[PDB]
C-alpha cells in the first residue's frame, strides 16, 4: 500500500542514518588502533635495544669486579711480603752493629798482642799463633759484616719494589672502580627506560579497542541485515 511504502520508507532512512553513525564510530576506532599498533612497533624495537645494552653493561660490570678481586689478591700477597721483610730489619741492623763492634774489638786485640810481640822480641811463638788466629777472626767478622749489610740492603730494596707495585695496583683499582660507577649509572638509566617501555607495552588499550571494534562491527552487521529486509520489502511493494 501507499501508506506501507511511507512507513517502511521512514524505517529505511532511520536504518541508513544509524549505520552511517556506527560506521563513523568504527572508523575512528580503527584509526586510533592504527596509531597504537605503530607506537607498539616503535617501543618494541627500542625495548629490544635497551635490554641488549643492559646485558652488555652487566657483563662489563661483572668483568670489572673480577679484575678488581684479582688486583686485591695480588695486593695481599705483596703486603705479606712487605711485612715479612720488615720483621727482619731490626734483627739485621742489630747483627750489623754487633759485627762492627766485633771488628773494632779484634783490631784492638791485634794491636795489643802485636805490642807484646814487639816488646818481647822463646814463647813468642805462642803469641804469633794467637796473632794468626786473631787475624782469621777479624777477617771472618768483616766478611760477615759485608754479608749482613748486603742482605739488609736487599730486603729494603725488595720492600720498596713491593710498595711501588702496590701503589700501581691501587691506581689500577681506582680506574676500574671509576668505570664501575659509570656502569652503575648507565644501568640505572637503562633499567628505567626499559621499565617505561614495558609499561607502554602493557598499555593495554589496544585490546580495549579490538573488542569494542568487534562489538560495533557486530551491530553494523545487524543493522545491515534489517536494512536488507526493509529494502526487499520496499522493492516488492
Residue numbers in the entry: 345 to 465, 696 to 811
What does the original paper state about this entry?
Multi-subunit SMC complexes control chromosome superstructure and promote chromosome disjunction, conceivably by actively translocating along DNA double helices. SMC subunits comprise an ABC ATPase “head” and a “hinge” dimerization domain connected by a 49 nm coiled-coil “arm. The heads undergo ATP-dependent engagement and disengagement to drive SMC action on the chromosome. Here, we elucidate the architecture of prokaryotic Smc dimers by high-throughput cysteine cross-linking and crystallography.
To do so, we first determined the structure of the upper region of the Py Smc coiled coil, designated as PySmcCC3, comprising residues 345–468 and 694–814 connected via a SGGS linker. The structure refined to 2 Å resolution showed that, while the N-terminal α helix is continuous, the C-terminal helix contains a short non-helical region. This region (residues 774–779) exhibits barely traceable electron densities, and the opposing portion of the N-terminal helix displays better, but weak, electron densities. Helical wheel analysis and sequence alignment indicate that the non-helical region in Py Smc arises from a 2 aa deletion in comparison with other Smc protein, e.g., Bs Smc, which completes a heptad repeat in this region (right). In addition, the N-terminal helix bends noticeably at residue P434, which is unlikely to bear functional importance since P434 is not a conserved residue.
